[PDB]
Amino acid sequence: GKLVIWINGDKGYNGLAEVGKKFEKDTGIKVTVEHPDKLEEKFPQVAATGDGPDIIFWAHDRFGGYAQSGLLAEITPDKAFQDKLYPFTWDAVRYNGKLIAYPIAVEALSLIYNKDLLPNPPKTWEEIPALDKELKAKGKSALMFNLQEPYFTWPLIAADGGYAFKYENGKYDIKDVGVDNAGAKAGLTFLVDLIKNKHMNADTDYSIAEAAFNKGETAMTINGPWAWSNIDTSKVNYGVTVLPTFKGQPSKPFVGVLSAGIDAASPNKELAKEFLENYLLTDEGLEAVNKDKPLGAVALKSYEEELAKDPRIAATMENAQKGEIMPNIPQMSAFWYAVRTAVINAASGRQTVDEALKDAQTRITVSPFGGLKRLPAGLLLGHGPIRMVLAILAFLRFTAIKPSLGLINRWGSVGKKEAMEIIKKFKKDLAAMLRIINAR
Amino acid sequence: KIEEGKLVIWINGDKGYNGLAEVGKKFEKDTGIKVTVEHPDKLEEKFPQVAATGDGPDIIFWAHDRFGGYAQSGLLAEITPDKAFQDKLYPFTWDAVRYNGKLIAYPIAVEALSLIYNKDLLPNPPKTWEEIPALDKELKAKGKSALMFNLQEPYFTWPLIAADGGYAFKYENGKYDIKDVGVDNAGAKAGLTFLVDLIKNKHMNADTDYSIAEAAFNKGETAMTINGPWAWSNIDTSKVNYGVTVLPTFKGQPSKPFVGVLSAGIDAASPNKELAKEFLENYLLTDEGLEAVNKDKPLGAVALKSYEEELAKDPRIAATMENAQKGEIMPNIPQMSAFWYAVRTAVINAASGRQTVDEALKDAQTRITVSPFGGLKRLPAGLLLGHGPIRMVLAILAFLRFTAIKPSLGLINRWGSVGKKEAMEIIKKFKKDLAAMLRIINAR
Numbered sequence: 072g073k074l075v076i077w078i079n080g081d082k083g084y085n086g087l088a089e090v091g092k093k094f095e096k097d098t099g100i101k102v103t104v105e106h107p108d109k110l111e112e113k114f115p116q117v118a119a120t121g122d123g124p125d126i127i128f129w130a131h132d133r134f135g136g137y138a139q140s141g142l143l144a145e146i147t148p149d150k151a152f153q154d155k156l157y158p159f160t161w162d163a164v165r166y167n168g169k170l171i172a173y174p175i176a177v178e179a180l181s182l183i184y185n186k187d188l189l190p191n192p193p194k195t196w197e198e199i200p201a202l203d204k205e206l207k208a209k210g211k212s213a214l215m216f217n218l219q220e221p222y223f224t225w226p227l228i229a230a231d232g233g234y235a236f237k238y239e240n241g242k243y244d245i246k247d248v249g250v251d252n253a254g255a256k257a258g259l260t261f262l263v264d265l266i267k268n269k270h271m272n273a274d275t276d277y278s279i280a281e282a283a284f285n286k287g288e289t290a291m292t293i294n295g296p297w298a299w300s301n302i303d304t305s306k307v308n309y310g311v312t313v314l315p316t317f318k319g320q321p322s323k324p325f326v327g328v329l330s331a332g333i334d335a336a337s338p339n340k341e342l343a344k345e346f347l348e349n350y351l352l353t354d355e356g357l358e359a360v361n362k363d364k365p366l367g368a369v370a371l372k373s374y375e376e377e378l379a380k381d382p383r384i385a386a387t388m389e390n391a392q393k394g395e396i397m398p399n400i401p402q403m404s405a406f407w408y409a410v411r412t413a414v415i416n417a418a419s420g421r422q423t424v425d426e427a428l429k430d431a432q433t434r435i436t437v438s439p440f441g442g443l444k445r446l447p448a449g450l451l452l453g454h455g456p457i458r459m460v461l462a463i464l465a466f467l468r469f470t471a472i473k474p475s476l477g478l479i480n481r482w483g484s485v486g487k488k489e490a491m492e493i494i495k496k497f498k499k500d501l502a503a504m505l506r507i508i509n510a511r
Numbered sequence: 512k513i514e515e516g517k518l519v520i521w522i523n524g525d526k527g528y529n530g531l532a533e534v535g536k537k538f539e540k541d542t543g544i545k546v547t548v549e550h551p552d553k554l555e556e557k558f559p560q561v562a563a564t565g566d567g568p569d570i571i572f573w574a575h576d577r578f579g580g581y582a583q584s585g586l587l588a589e590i591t592p593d594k595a596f597q598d599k600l601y602p603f604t605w606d607a608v609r610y611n612g613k614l615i616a617y618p619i620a621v622e623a624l625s626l627i628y629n630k631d632l633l634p635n636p637p638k639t640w641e642e643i644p645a646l647d648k649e650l651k652a653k654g655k656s657a658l659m660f661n662l663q664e665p666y667f668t669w670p671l672i673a674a675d676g677g678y679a680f681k682y683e684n685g686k687y688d689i690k691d692v693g694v695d696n697a698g699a700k701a702g703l704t705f706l707v708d709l710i711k712n713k714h715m716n717a718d719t720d721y722s723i724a725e726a727a728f729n730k731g732e733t734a735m736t737i738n739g740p741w742a743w744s745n746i747d748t749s750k751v752n753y754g755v756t757v758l759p760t761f762k763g764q765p766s767k768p769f770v771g772v773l774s775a776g777i778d779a780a781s782p783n784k785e786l787a788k789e790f791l792e793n794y795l796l797t798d799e800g801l802e803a804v805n806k807d808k809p810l811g812a813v814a815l816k817s818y819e820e821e822l823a824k825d826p827r828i829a830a831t832m833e834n835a836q837k838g839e840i841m842p843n844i845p846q847m848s849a850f851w852y853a854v855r856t857a858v859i860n861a862a863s864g865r866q867t868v869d870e871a872l873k874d875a876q877t878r879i880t881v882s883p884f885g886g887l888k889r890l891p892a893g894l895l896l897g898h899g900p901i902r903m904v905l906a907i908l909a910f911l912r913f914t915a916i917k918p919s920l921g922l923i924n925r926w927g928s929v930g931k932k933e934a935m936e937i938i939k940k941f942k943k944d945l946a947a948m949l950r951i952i953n954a955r
């Protein structure tokens with residue numbers, strides 16, 4: 072028995088490793104926490120393969136897609152444990168009447184400002200152009216945040232009416248997509264204008280923004296509670312407040328519930344549930360993670376009634392209420408990827424705001440059709456890379472269809488040692504398919 | 512079924528498999544390796560489905576025409592006889608088992624169809640096909656029939672089709688041209704029209720098969736039949752006093768039967784290849800081995816020089832050799848599989864009346880020239896969205912996993928709605944299909 076944990080690199084993974092080493096002292100079970108990049112994308116590729124984690128930590132929005140593929144184990148908490156966490160966090164990890172993860176903490180973006188460079192932060196977005204010009208004369212800048220991840224750009228886009236999927240009477244409408252309406256265009260136009268008027272740089276990312284704010288070079292940034300730890304060390308005199316309003320409407324950040332899912336085929340399910348229920352989601356467990364990087368508003372009632380007395384957590388909750396909970400439907404991946412493309416292309420000038428958001432809408436409504444419209448041209452006649460050629464040969468053998476002579480000539484000419492190892496990998500792929508189903 | 516330390520042999524049911532079983536018993540006594548002879552139906556079709564799976568034979572006995580297709584898929588082991596053994600067999604039978612400069616089987620016997628006639632009912636067999644309609648009416652007046660043979664396999668219908676120029680693939684400069692198919696020329700139309708006229712004019716019945724034809728001749732109900740040397744054994748016991756001669760001519764041109772060289776191939780993935788080579792070279796392809804098979808059912812003109820020089824003094828073997836020269840050796844190229852399947856449909860449909868002779872052979876010709884492109888033009892409509900039989904959708908899901916391609920939402924929920932183990936056993940067959948692919952690849 073052993074536990075392998077995956078968590079994002081901006082969260083307190085060292086603190087989590089301490090509760091894991093607490094677990095090991097008590098149980099003798101090894102616990103390993105890793106922070107791979109794009110782990111939310113890697114998980115469906117490694118689930119049920121033995122190459123993945125027993126426990127995956129990410130915002131709740133990605134877990135519905137995992138569940139629809141049958142990759143997440145359904146959790147079975149006791150009523151007593153169920154009541155230890157806030158009902159709002161349990162709903163974030165519910166998908167088709169089943170719980171598919173343990174909710175950990177509520178995270179929401181907030182405005183972080185340098186009190187020495189700006190004692191009175193702007194209440195509206197429109198104050199920032201005039202405010203940037205004034206600080207630029209003093210060798211500073213008004214605002215810097217990560218423009219290349221749509222999580223950070225969305226609060227302004229949704230402010231005046233942008234939305235992902237329309238939500239009417241308890242269900243999401245996967246075909247009513249609102250990334251291309253008037254309010255979305257209004258917010259994204261304003262953001263591009265800031266870049267054209269040299270108030271922001273379109274290439275700015277997370278590290279540049281956070282380094283700039285912690286170096287006292289920018290007055291404001293937009294970030295979540297995890298950022299507070301490094302501002303503390305940097306001794307920047309900072310505050311956390313509500314995001315500026317746009318066209319009088321408040322900014323509407325997408326609210327994330329950090330959640331821990333278990334691989335449906337993991338041999339260590341009961342060890343995973345025990346670690347999550349009895350070690351991490353306790354006062355001491357979450358305090359260990361919180362000390363490394365702040366979790367935000369935790370789902371555990373006892374600890375959150377103490378956390379709620381910090382004005383930074385109060386600001387997070389207030390920004391969180393102005394926003395909305397992220398959907399957990401599988402189409403969210405298409406939503407994020409399309410919106411990431413649109414905001415970067417508009418900010419860099421490769422498309423207009425109207426061209427960028429329309430394409431973003433077409434991706435979303437067309438993505439449920441899958442990554443493949445039709446086998447690559449000439450594949451069933453033997454044209455293509457050998458790995459894809461062996462895949463289609465395996466397919467035709469599975470279906471008892473006689474392959475073309477072009478395929479058979481490719482089948483005869485491929486190297487013995489290379490074709491064998493490729494086809495052994497195919498067997499490892501089917502081995503995973505078997506485990507996913509047997510875990511149902 | 513395939514196991515190490517034993518040999519499993521597949522041979523057609525009309526051949527002398529009991530005689531072959533006796534040489535296998537002799538092999539077992541000498542070596543301790545048990546030999547098991549089986550005669551499943553459609554074994555020439557079943558072998559490619561079971562090759563390299565352990566459910567097939569170590570040795571397959573069939574005419575050479577099917578072995579080139581087996582070789583193109585890498586299912587046949589390459590043969591490595593010494594030059595000394597090579598000269599024990601006639602050089603031309605080795606040509607029947609040569610494919611892409613490699614030998615892929617052992618030649619056993621040369622088989623050719625011949626005209627078998629009841630000497631008591633007809634002392635002077637016809638020289639031309641056109642004599643038989645007039646010959647039938649006279650025997651029908653006595654309650655008999657002139658000719659009945661297996662119409663359901665084109666092997667028997669082909670000698671009359673090829674007489675006036677029907678051919679499989681043209682032969683240019685020692686090579687076979689896959690794109691010049693001669694199933695639709697005037698002579699092909701001419702020969703099959705004659706055969707349909709016989710059925711219209713109630714000289715033959717389109718439903719006649721091997722079992723019906725052979726029963727009547729052995730019961731003295733028909734004067735003539737068309738069959739190969741394997742058939743002589745049942746006519747001997749029946750005490751019908753018969754003869755074996757040349758097939759009648761049609762439009763002055765001789766009948767050109769496709770000649771088959773009965774051959775033994777070895778599975779490219781067999782653990783008993785050395786045992787197979789040793790059994791084939793040292794026990795069966797000997798005077799004693801082939802005589803044991805020939806006593807059960809006649810092999811025809813064997814490829815082994817020493818034994819055939821005794822066989823050739825039999826007039827029936829002379830007639831078999833004679834018809835063999837009037838015909839041509841079959842190509843062993845993979846498209847022969849398409850050719851035979853195609854002219855089987857054409858001859859059955861024209862004989863049963865479902866199409867005209869000219870349309871039947873034209874469509875027969877198109878299938879032959881289209882077979883290189885494979886059995887699939889494109890995936891069934893809606894397959895990538897989850898619509899289709901359960902096995903093919905899970906196959907395409909496996910394919911998208913192999914290639915790291917995101918599946919559609921229709922595919923994902925079909926994946927969610929499938930029976931838990933109905934999918935698990937479908938996927939285990941997938942696990943073993945790849946296991947077979949691996950053995951085929953590693954067998955080179």
Ligand SMILES: OC[C@H]1O[C@H](O[C@H]2[C@H](O)[C@@H](O)[C@@H](O)O[C@@H]2CO)[C@H](O)[C@@H](O)[C@@H]1O
Pocket residue numbers: 079081111130131132133178220221222223327407
């Ligand atoms: O930007 C798209 C991205 O947004 C969210 O990711 C957040 C995450 O929730 C936070 O914990 C933190 O790691 O910042 C991320 C943005 O870089 C969604 O959770 C994610 O699915 C989506 O792709």
Ligand SMILES: OC[C@H]1O[C@H](O[C@H]2[C@H](O)[C@@H](O)[C@@H](O)O[C@@H]2CO)[C@H](O)[C@@H](O)[C@@H]1O
Pocket residue numbers: 523525555573574575576577622664665666667771773851
């Ligand atoms: O009829 C199609 C069939 O013809 C030949 O098969 C022969 C075989 O050669 C003989 O040994 C004997 O078994 O009669 C068979 C016909 O019933 C071809 O060799 C074969 O490929 C083809 O399918």
